Design a protein around this ligand. Structure first.
Ligand SMILES: NC(=O)c1ccc[n+]([C@@H]2O[C@H](COP(=O)([O-])OP(=O)(O)OC[C@H]3O[C@@H](n4cnc5c(N)ncnc54)[C@H](OP(=O)(O)O)[C@@H]3O)[C@@H](O)[C@H]2O)c1
Ligand SMILES: Nc1ncnc2c1ncn2[C@@H]1O[C@H](COP(=O)(O)OP(=O)(O)O)[C@@H](O)[C@H]1OP(=O)(O)O
Ligand SMILES: O=C(NO)[C@H](O)[C@H](O)COP(=O)(O)O
Ligand SMILES: [Cl-]
Ligand SMILES: [Cl-]
Lengths: 469, 469
């Protein structure tokens, strides 16, 4: 009926896949659509009859509708369902065809699928797609990985549909590297999102608990903060949330929302542990959510555990600014950690990850978009082999000038009893990373004492075991 | 040569010493190692003992009285898998195979199921106390079928350490399949946490108070007489005595500050992340080791990243005492975290772990032997479903009284620029745990704003979504 007439194909007509399909169609292409449950594909075709969509009832019809090399994008449920869908397609595809998985996929799955499909002569592009439903429709940040020759054939469409960066119109997509490099970068992006959210949460909690500020007051502070170097979409979201009234009562909706946070957030931290990378801030943020889910225990504990009962006496304006600095500083700690993880992963899996570009493509179509991403890109433009962001001139100056405030904020908060797990982690990482010598000599001694694990010395090469008895 | 009542495979530090422990209880012990020269060394150095030198597995298996009792202390992972694979075909129905290495519990769980109907009884056990523990009395944490346990319980009790308090052996049934190796994994997690807390304390005494190793040794010596009385503090004061064996000065000052690890701490943090358990103190200590391995980077950073240079001008005796309190306070938080994880693990894997007994068997032959273990046991006798140690009167009281000192120590450390990731994690955990309300309400608002993830309300049951537009 429409044999080899479609330029691009999408499997999965839930909102994301539908939205992507429409994004692609809007760019001047005929797009074949498929969904396991056909009624859903019917609904899409019926309400978009004016578009160049090709309605397909079966995988055979779907595959047959596409020009070769076939470019097919999976937007189906992650895990077993994506493997089922891949397995369903394999027999119909020709050698040289290109499958693309745009689901939030754990990267080792992508690495396996890519390898297995390559034995069948099928290219596999594991692609991270940020921005949610609106992003899929209008412009996502995309992080593709897989065979470079295949990706070069998909690139034009991705660059056309991707979010364009507001500062220079550059598409928020680029080739990340082989096999699972694409979904790896997306994972780190999701970790980073968790960390940015927890840091804003602490900033909010300090302003509320210690300085006693109202929601309107805190809204104003975030607004003012967002006009400076902190400029970020998450802060914009935050000051918007603080405006809104309760839809089923009096006051503000944010004060009615139960503090039990909602999975896959653990992935970045899991890889960090596996790779030997210190990723304390994002991992503390994950654990911040976990402990909020222990609400019932905290209610009990709030009634028996003691803590300080202070009324703040200092200068409110001075401390608000000290908190502002602590936020930017700590956010910088988290990104340094996250890009150091990316560096290790790149060595481990041999991906030559393009670090400056990753920051560039996060400038739009994703929740972590912020202006200071440009400073990250500046840093790797200057030196692609930069081991850690903290060593670049810009970030050296920031930390030199902001660390004092961080410290005052930590003393203030800890003395008052306000929990600040990420802020405290930030300054602990700064003071660890810059320590020429750490007390790990003592740990090594202990391990040798009880376990005979051996150690290295400071004055000569070799492996040594002391006789402690 | 069927003289042998017990058999040990692996003649590195742990297996050699376990063999000698068992032989000293009045048994003849078969010994085997893959490199034969090691087995030769221990045979020749102990001709007075009743050991059977074997050079093949066929010989080793042949030398044991049926039903055979064979214990492996082999390098974890692939080596252990292969050793067992080689050994299984030689074994007879009724024989008992014990894996006493630090095996990742999923491997043991898999092994148990595979061996279920083989007629070969299987036990995966944790072993504590290091080389001297193995020689004189280890704490042991075995899991498997209860029937298998009961066949090795008698000899386990004989070799086990005996608690000084009541003479009770430091071994007990932990539960089904991988329960034992899981409990040992948490043990090591708790241990990483205390080791890092001790290291931080050392760092504070050395860098802020400016104290010599003699002065610091004396301090830890006094602490060990009080409520801090523990294995790790005991050996810490021993390490700080010893002088360099290949030069002048103290050995601890000649050991390179690159902390090694063999995966048990990492595994604990990974299980916490999978299970939804907040485990910041222990995880921060794993990351503290990871950052110690980034020595080259830290040397580079220390020349570029600036920080405070304050001179402690206060009362040293008073600050030392605050550090003590803080250390005991934080030690407790590590344990409270560990047991909270054991509770969640027990539920997930249907193990019904005996929390109170675990504490009992850690009273000797145990790297994490501490004075307050009975208070842990008391707390669980009182309430079997106790959710967290911090809810028990005993620990409520300690935290009430020492909490102020933790805050002064954190504040002093942070103003001085000395990294204290585990101390800051401790008070952050405490302050989060006792918080009835945390700022996860803002996180949920944000998530519902950008992804429509839904939220619970503070005032009514049900799932809600807000129309943010
Ligand atoms: N050391 C401690 O403080 C301590 C405490 C508690 C538990 N553990 C656990 O107990 C077990 C043994 O510990 P350990 O410290 O005595 O020594 P280890 O270094 O972990 O293991 C060495 C033993 O494993 C064998 N082995 C190593 N690689 C092998 C391979 N690729 N294939 C076959 N066999 C191999 C060695 O034989 P060869 O001599 O021929 O190389 C040797 O007998 C480990 O699982 C460890 O985690 C250790
Ligand atoms: N086992 C499976 N095999 C093939 N496709 C599947 C699948 N499970 C889910 N999907 C597809 O995966 C899509 C939904 O995945 P998802 O969990 O990411 O959804 P959403 O993002 O809407 O929550 C749907 O198109 C679904 O097809 P149906 O519309 O027929 O349900
Ligand atoms: O189980 C043990 N002692 O508890 C072993 O010595 C173990 O190897 C110690 O952990 P680590 O070697 O990862 O530091
Ligand atoms: Cl590839
Ligand atoms: Cl996003």
């Amino acid at each position: 009926h429409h044999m080899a007439q479609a330029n691009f194909g999408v499997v999965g007509m839930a909102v994301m896949g539908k939205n992507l399909a429409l994004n692609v169609e809007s760019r001047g292409y005929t797009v074949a659509i498929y969904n396991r449950t056909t009624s859903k594909t019917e609904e899409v075709f019926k309400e978009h009859q004016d578009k160049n969509l090709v309605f397909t009832k079966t995988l055979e019809e779907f595959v047959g509708s596409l020009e070769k090399p076939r470019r097919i994008m999976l937007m189906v449920q992650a895990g077993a369902a994506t493997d089922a869908t891949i397995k369903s397609l394999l027999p119909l595809l020709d050698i040289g065809d290109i499958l693309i998985d745009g689901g939030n996929t754990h990267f080792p799955d992508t690495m396996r699928r890519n390898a297995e499909l390559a034995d069948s002569g099928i290219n596999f592009i594991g692609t991270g797609v940020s921005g949610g439903e609106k992003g899929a429709l209008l412009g996502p940040s995309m992080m593709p990985g897989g065979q470079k020759e295949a990706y070069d054939l998909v690139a034009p469409i991705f660059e056309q549909i991707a979010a364009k960066a507001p500062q220079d119109g550059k598409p928020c997509v680029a080739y990340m590297g082989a096999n699972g490099a694409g979904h790896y970068v997306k994972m780190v992006h999701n970790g980073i999102e968790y960390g940015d959210m927890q840091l804003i949460a602490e900033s909010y909690d300090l302003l509320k608990r210690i300085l006693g500020l109202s929601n309107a007051e805190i809204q104003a502070i975030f607004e003012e903060w967002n006009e400076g170097e902190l400029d970020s979409y998450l802060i914009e979201i935050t000051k918007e949330v603080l405006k809104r009234k309760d839809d089923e009562g009096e006051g503000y909706i944010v004060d009615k929302i139960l503090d039990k946070a909602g999975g896959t957030g653990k992935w970045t931290s899991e890889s960090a542990l596996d790779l030997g990378v210190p990723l304390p801030l994002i991992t503390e943020s994950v654990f911040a959510r976990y402990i909020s889910t222990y609400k019932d225990e905290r209610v009990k504990a709030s009634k028996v555990l003691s803590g300080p009962a202070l009324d703040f006496s200092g200068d409110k304006k001075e401390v608000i600014e000290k908190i502002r600095k602590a936020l930017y500083f700590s956010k910088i700690m988290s990104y340094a950690q996250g890009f150091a993880q990316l560096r290790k992963a790149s060595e481990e899996f041999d991906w030559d990850l393009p670090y400056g570009t990753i920051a560039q493509i996060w400038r739009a179509g994703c929740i972590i978009r912020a202006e200071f991403l440009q400073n990250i890109t500046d840093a790797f433009d200057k030196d692609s082999e930069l081991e850690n962001l903290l060593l670049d001139d810009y970030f050296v100056d920031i930390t030199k000038r902001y660390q004092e405030a961080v410290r005052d904020v930590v003393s203030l908060a800890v003395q008052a009893g306000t929990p600040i797990p990420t802020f405290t982690s930030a300054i602990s990482y700064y003071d660890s990373y810059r320590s020429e010598n750490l007390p790990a000599n003592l740990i090594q001694a202990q391990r040798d004492y009880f376990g005979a694990h051996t150690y290295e010395r400071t004055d000569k090469a070799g492996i040594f075991h002391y006789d402690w008895y």
